[model samples]
Target: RAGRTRSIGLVIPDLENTSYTRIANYLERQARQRGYQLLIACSEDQPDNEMRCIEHLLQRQVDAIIVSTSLPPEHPFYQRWANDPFPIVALDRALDREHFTSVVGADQDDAEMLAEELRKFPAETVLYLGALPELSVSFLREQGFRTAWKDDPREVHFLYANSYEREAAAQLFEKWLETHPMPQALFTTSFALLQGVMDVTLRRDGKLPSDLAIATFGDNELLDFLQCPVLAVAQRHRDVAERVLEIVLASLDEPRKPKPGLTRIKRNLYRRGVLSR
Candidate 1:
């Protein structure tokens, strides 16, 4: 609780995904302006690597640490570190205990919005591709999807990449497509997952299925220029970063006080129009 370092450590699950990159960059820029240095560590979505990253950051004597952890909430690691002396800020997923402050997207609400948008297409057969079933955000999004379809007669299928990497998503989705007919609409949980499924569709069918509809949880600039229009939920990464800084700084001043618990940032719906033929 000495707060001598004036440095904050950031642990993110992946560097390849632009979503995480945006959050990390924004956090760094904002922290720098406040006279705090940022030390970043990528966990590659591995539990062991996440632990290692946290341990290394603690050793470096950072004043606080921020993590978008790789492990699920049930993991024992969170329980063990529940009462650590330093402040911890969780982004994207809250660690199991209440002692840590968390800044996360309105994941379930955003996913429900995506599902509602797809239903507007009057889609009968739908597929939802999610990454990392163990992740809190994934579980919340899937719950949202199920909730949206509770009383509806629309057919829905669910598949998981088990990893956030695009390659894993591509392989799982490709194999599923081989055995099963393409769904009328597809909703993916992340930009990488969406890209992987899109890559498979283009390579196998020579283009996007004209009859298929697509929606995803994360938005990208590249989605705008595509021939197919996609409905996406865009998380407010800048606000999330700013909130994290606020919580961290507050916790530093009052080290012994209870944390702020979970803070959910609002999300935006990004709609793209199809290019004119």
Candidate 2:
């Protein structure tokens, strides 16, 4: 037990991605101001590694644990964590069980917005270049796209690279192009796929503007550097840190929290009036 010297444990997918880096930065400052130190770990999106991280946090004897896990919902880990011995909070991408607190941004609205924009053009097929199909975010985004595009004529195609390597996704794009007609629109779940898709699209001889539109699921400023307009589903984590701290603090004093809850962090769509390079 931390006793008077309280602490928390945070486990994220990968620090290589600035997205999780930003989260770590925010969480650290919040914890420090509240007189608590945080023990951090990165699982690199590996399920087995994720479980190990949690075990490490247990050894630290932190008051609470926060994790951004990549394990599938059906995995035994969730069943194990469903009735955790200590307080646990899921972050970013969510897991199957909702017995513990989880913070996630709204994904349906992003997909709906994309579908609405693509329908404005004569787009036929939309590509979902995602990292891992097993990831909760990927599954939710796919579910959202299907429902959002129910009335639309566009068809959403799936491509998984299992890793967020640019070359991997780019290679897949080139191979798919050689065997099939160019997709009317491309939507990537990760920047790695987006970069690869863009490289392939730029090098190709034909297609421009409405012929093949592209977008991604990040608020990255690189989009502004391009002469072309890229649709974005941007998330704002500015207030998330405070919410996390509040939840963590609340759980610390509460006893035997039988039922857990989820907090949906909302995001904004970056669509209109994008500046050119």
Candidate 3:
């Protein structure tokens, strides 16, 4: 039997995100229910910050740690943790399976599912918007889209927008629109980018394009009232959090052979349209 309460640590890439906030809240609730103490840290999407955060968590000597970092697997800080004794589980992003004990995150195969759903629309072009230049999630999602549309003839263009900032996305969109025709269908990675695109479109002509089709990877309440309701690929954040926590707890219970690897969680695609509008 255990002698003392087990403490868990969660390290997130950014605290400003609703998705991350929801995951943190769910994990905290679950930990409290099980009579365990939880420690939370945000890395602000910086490698240095992530290093500091991880060092602090390790210093606290938490029983286990869960990370939702966006850093690349080859990063030095991750290498340090790879050699550590604590049980580490990565949440919502892929890491080098050879290092982390387990990974709990989205399937990414749903990107093709979302593309298949978009094919039903009559759009000639599908514009992919919003991605940081070097992020792993950006590369994975982009690859998924490419694999899904490898045989299609429709024009697909990629435009870079700073991951979550609205003004930056708006500026990039304005410049892109000046050179190319407006896309008939739009796909984006996050709700913030979706809103930024919408804001630009509205200001350009006082409304969205008449035949503009929209799809994105996440769901938000604000999407309900849009002229064209966006199709979304939704993640089961709470389910993922709980499942990851369970995996960590199990690993702690039995000191079995370490099976460091990636765990891919399946995602669901949601389709909606303004059938009347």
Candidate 4:
């Protein structure tokens, strides 16, 4: 209803996650800088909700859209609007390769880097806690984790949760702990899972274990404030936002450009007392 404001549509899986909010805030500013603004919508982690939101975004007559989803390519909504004139750019979430041009960190490369780091730790065995197996990004990260250590005698295991909720990760880790001893090291593919694992591990030992190590995908306040050091791969959100703006700008100029392709944003690895690599 505002006057003369160039608008863009932004869709995300969940607003609760800083991952999406931060990106949205940055994008909004970038949009404003270009004499445009954004209309934000959240699926809140549902496919059906996403489609409905997409319809609304369309009705609003935004120039283009950016979406992040965990649903399958076969999902009706994806198959339907994927080829529409409205350019859809995927962020963080995986998309059907045929549908959208996406910007994300190289998942496999990240996993391989983590695996190499884990191998250096004293633990001969490592465990990977992942979320949304359907998302190719998480799946590919797990694969890289496995393949990296396949040649070595080191042991590694991959586990998944029913959802990416923090509680689910805690409960899953708690149950697994009952039947199996904790491994020498662990890698969490999602921040929520990392939070859950932290809840469980903190209860078992108020202080982190010296022999056991943990590595994860997100580098946020939670990890920054940790008393014990943990390795993390932080998303290059600035780079992603830049790449996204590039695509969005290009789309705006031509209104139907930036065909389906994947853009890899390099993630930065971090740890306390150690410089980012």
Candidate 5:
């Protein structure tokens, strides 16, 4: 019943992270094809910054917002926005309050699949490095790991980076390495975490661990160049963008329409090289 701008706002944490960058690319192209302008904002993985981005977009009167927020589920922002009729769709990270749609990767399923793949190796001790402990995706991934290893006797340890930046992940992993013995297998929840783990490994041992099996939630082309075999669970960025825009365009078409809640897209698990099977 109101005027339309024919524009969508996308809020992502960092543009440097290829994971989100890929999604942005697809979203921008698809949005343009649909005769809508895409406006992007960076939150730099900060709650305050995320809020600022949303407010700015709202001020512009964009049709809807697609955000990958850094805020935790319990944050007051979710509660405040719950009653707001403005269309908001979360991507990658989910905000669980009412009146919102979230398009996220199947984190739990991806983790389970990765754990299953890692099971082929005889790694008795496996360490999982997850980022943003406050986020649901992080929780789901940890749950996935525990669920996959529920019946298995293999020892699993969990650690959180608290930040998505590579430096934070490296510091956390390095500190953990000081006291704890190296695990037989390591699973990182993001490309930055994977880089952090690799940074520590290179600094300590002067090379990647040949005996340690490595896996990550996101993929990178450089992984193939490494001597150590790396397994990655890559989010389907194109598919995720498609789903996100689907919700966005639908909401724009009918502002009063109820939003589809919690759409989880599948992930692709692949190996860059050979593990010691």
Candidate 6:
């Protein structure tokens, strides 16, 4: 009923993570360019907190809502939102299609690319470490690993650290090393867990394994300072934000029917040259 510029609300799982913050900054910049006011809430990956954030944003009567949620798919809030009137767009992760309007973010294909790159290493074992057990990305990345080494004898191991806490990951790694031999290479979905793995390895011995290899989902500029340059699936955060904004804006004008949605963004793999030591 108001003629003023519409306001949009964005809800992300963790504000402390640079990835989410980058997306938020991009969305805010885009909103400003379009004369729309943007409001943001960080859920910190807690289901209850995420619900409260969504409720608060709805109370404020935002024209649209964008969520980068980490809540389980079976949560009651998903059911409730399925019936809500306002348009909702998801980012970073997907929700049950019966409930969400549209989704924009990475998909299994990207993780497959990462696994393909990791297969080039001469490691005897591969390990994947991460936080969420039910996340689709975890399953997809694991599947990608399987696909890459379908006939290979390299043992693939998985470690769930509960969250991306460095100490917790280190503890888990210690326990794992006691039970199983040290892996030749490690693969992880988050940068935080990767850092923790490296910390544990360094604490055990100052130098990384000459034959050891590491590959992870995200990339950071500081990786060059490490003892060994890490191989990773590098995502362009700003590009993802821009594409998401485009999808959200297009949906606003067209009012299209909702459908089960999934979007995959390609990833660039990074590694040092063969002659580099």
The candidate that achieves the highest TM-score relative to the unseen native structure: 3
Instruction: Please give the lDDT score for candidate 6.
Output: 0.73
Candidate with more favorable, higher lDDT: 2 or 4: 4
Q: What lDDT does model 1 reach?
A: 0.82
lDDT of 1 by residue, 47-73 (tens): 899999999998999988999987776
TM-score for candidate 3, please give it. 0.86
Summarize candidate 6's per-residue lDDT along 3-52 as a digit string, tens digits. 32378888887667777888788889988998778879888877788889
Model 2 TM-score (2 dp): 0.80
Q: Which residue pairs show collisions in model 2?
A: none
In order, candidate lDDTs are: 0.82, 0.72, 0.76, 0.77, 0.82, 0.73
List candidate 1 stretches off by more than 4 Å: 1-3, 72-81, 131-136, 159-181, 254-260, 273-277
Worst 10 residues of 4 by lDDT: 268-277
lDDT of 3 by residue, 22-132 (tens): 878888898889877888888887778877887898787788888877677656567766766667788876567887855554535777777667767878877988679
lDDT, ranked from best to worst: 5, 1, 4, 3, 6, 2
Which residue runs does candidate 3 get wrong by more than 4 Å? 1-4, 81-85, 104-107, 162-164, 255-258, 272-277
In model 5, which regions exceed 4 Å deviation?
Answer: 72-85, 131-135, 159-181, 254-260, 275-277
Q: Clashes in candidate 4: how many?
A: 0
TM-scores of the candidates are 0.82, 0.80, 0.86, 0.83, 0.83, 0.84
How far out, in Å, is residue 157 in model 2? Answer: 5.4
Which stretches of candidate 2 lie above 4 Å from their native place? 73-85, 95-98, 122-136, 154-164, 179-184, 206-212, 254-259, 272-277
**Poorly placed runs, candidate 6 (over 4 Å):** 2-4, 74-85, 104-107, 130-135, 179-181, 255-260, 272-277
Which stretch of 10 consecutive residues in model 6 shows the poorest summed lDDT? 268-277
